[PDB]
Amino acid sequence: AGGLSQLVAYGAQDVYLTGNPQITFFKTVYRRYTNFAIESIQQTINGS
């Protein structure tokens, strides 16, 4: 019973979805990125 009963319901029509699996969903790879910061700075307006 439970989720185990779905895992074992495995056959030919699952091959196109999970055979020779390429990815998982249970581990996210985050990409290391460059170091940066964002600052809001007021500009001078010329004219009235």
Partner 1 sequence: QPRGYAGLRPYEKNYEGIAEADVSALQARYLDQTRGRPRTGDGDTEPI
Q: How far is CA 38 from the centre of its chain?
A: 25
When computed from its CA atoms, the radius of gyration of the chain, rounded to whole angstroms, is 26
Q: What angle do CA 31, 36, 41 make, to 5 degrees?
A: 145
Total residues contacting partner 1 by CB under 8 A comes to 9
Q: Of the two residues 8 and 37, which places its CB atom closer to partner 1 in the complex?
A: 8
The interface mask with partner 1, positions 1-40, x = CB under 8 A, is ---xxx-xxxxxx---------------------------
Question: Cβ of residue 26: shortest distance to partner 1, in angstroms?
Answer: 16
